[PDB]
Amino acid sequence: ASLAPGSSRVELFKRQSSKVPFEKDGKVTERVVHSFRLPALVNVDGVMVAIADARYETSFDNSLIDTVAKYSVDDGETWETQIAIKNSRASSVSRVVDPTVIVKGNKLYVLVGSYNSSRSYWTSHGDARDWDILLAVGEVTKSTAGGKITASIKWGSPVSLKEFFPAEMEGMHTNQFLGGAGVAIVASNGNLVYPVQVTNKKKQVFSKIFYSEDEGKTWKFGKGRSAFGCSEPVALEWEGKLIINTRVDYRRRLVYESSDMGNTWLEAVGTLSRVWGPSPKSNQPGSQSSFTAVTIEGMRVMLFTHPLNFKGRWLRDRLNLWLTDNQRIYNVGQVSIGDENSAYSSVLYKDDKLYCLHEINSNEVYSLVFARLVGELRIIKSVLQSWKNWDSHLSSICTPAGCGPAVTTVGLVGFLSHSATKTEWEDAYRCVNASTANAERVPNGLKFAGVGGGALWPVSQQGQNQRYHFANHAFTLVASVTIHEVPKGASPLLGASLDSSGGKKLLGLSYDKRHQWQPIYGSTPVTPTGSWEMGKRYHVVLTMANKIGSVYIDGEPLEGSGQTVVPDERTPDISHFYVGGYKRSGMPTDSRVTVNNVLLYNRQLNAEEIRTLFLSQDLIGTEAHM
Ligand SMILES: *[C@]1(C(=O)O)O[C@@H]([C@H](O)[C@H](O)CNC(=O)c2ccccc2)[C@H](NC(C)=O)[C@@H](O)[C@H]1F
Ligand SMILES: [Cl-]
């Protein structure tokens, strides 16, 4: 893929070409840089600022590095270059590393680890003999040169914050810590907040919250932490909580939420945790990620980037952009070009303009290109228009009492309704479509029939990035159904499957030749219950929360519903939801049924919300508006 139409870029920090003002021995010389890495792009009072690593001689992490900075007043049309922080010059490999930036006022708060002579990766160090943690502040000043506007950043001498690092943390002895790289934040209470990666004497890595209530003079660590294995954390604030997105090498990315500045950390199992995989099989090294909360056209949202890493190891090709409102998760597309190597990145939203500063690597020689995400922001605005519209549409429906409670759109992730192509049932939220077989389009839905007939809404089948991972912890699946033929035995209607066939179910609804419902609770022996008549329309709700599954028909629980569907302590790994058959020609069954308006929620709905959905089933369809 490549940049969306209308978008373009330029190699801003050009490898082995761009020069910087390297200072040594009171002298200063324009020195060429082999590699530029660790991109951090921010907006300071109108000034666009780009911070990064200046790796003078090699791209090897443990070499000579200073923190470079280029700034613009014309939004990337022209840039001034400087060195924001120079390393100790103690050896040929002295360096200030992984700059992490926070903008507050006309101030740049830059946190970097500092090493003097070690040629070993920081996480392999057994002690802090070679380490320090420094904070440098750059103050921005705008003015006018030849009639036109100009600016200048004055950089302060870095200050050691090592005095704020406790020798002990709950059950361990501290070693070193660094910022999470990229861009950090100012909390809504004013606090400077840096998600930091810390090591202990057992050489384990884990993330913590390192914050300041006094503009940067003193610092504290939240009492809590992530699990071990969580590095380069990146955080944002969302609805009064910090959402900390972590890199986990060779594993799916863990995401945590903290309401108390890091004293307690809860994994975001019902929203973003384990959604993003570091590679197709999530068995390769991860990456630093841009993760920010922006307000586009009135709507608060989060932007996330990470490479797909098809190539493997650290190559990390295909830098992708994601959009989420903490409910739906949309893949905006690929920001890097073709299959170039593009790991670390930084996305900025400034004056309704979207930009990205990210790495491009060829033979371990890095450059930072500066891209104008024009087509991308177009797509983003459009998708948000779609979410706002469908939410407004559903919320404005006057439900049967003059009106009863409004249809709930809180936690509504996907909706399969009128729109369907020959092979796909389309998500009105435009994030995840369902694949189909033997389906005939009908108002607000599809009519199925035949061995192999049905629809498949992927969960673990989505692949590397699993937007419906939350379903393994809780969900509500809703649908209107009509059975056209009494089955020979027991046929599937709606369900959450644990395997690819649909034979190993988590929670499901089947119907049998004796006109009874067959709710399936995990691998528990089935017991038919209730009755139905052929050709009659029914309303079905499947919910799961607290390892318990329930099945409702026409708004009411079936007898004996509410059983444990998650047997032990291992978390489910739902493969997909099946609707109107298994969509597997390999399953014998034949479901002749019509299913309309399938809704997917990331929580268990309550009795009233279930009641309103039932009464309102003929009002929610997308049909009239396409
Ligand atoms: C990124 C990167 O992946 O490109 O990595 C971090 C850091 O090195 C990484 O989180 C940890 N490294 C390893 O686990 C490892 C390194 C080498 C060989 C095997 C394992 C860099 N930051 C630091 C402080 O090293 C960052 O600059 C960048 F290289
Ligand atoms: Cl320890």
From TrEMBL:
Phylogenetic classification of the source organism: Eukaryota, Discoba, Euglenozoa, Kinetoplastea, Metakinetoplastina
Record GO biological process: ganglioside catabolic process; oligosaccharide catabolic process
GO molecular function: exo-alpha-sialidase activity
One Gene Ontology CC term in the entry: membrane
All copies of domain Sialidase, residue ranges: 39-359
Name of the protein in question: Trans-sialidase
The keyword Repeat appears for this protein: yes
Disulfide cysteine pairs (residue numbers): 398-403
Pfam families in the record: BNR_3, TS_C
Domain annotation Trans-sialidase C-terminal: ranges: 409-607
Keywords: Repeat
Position of the signal peptide: none
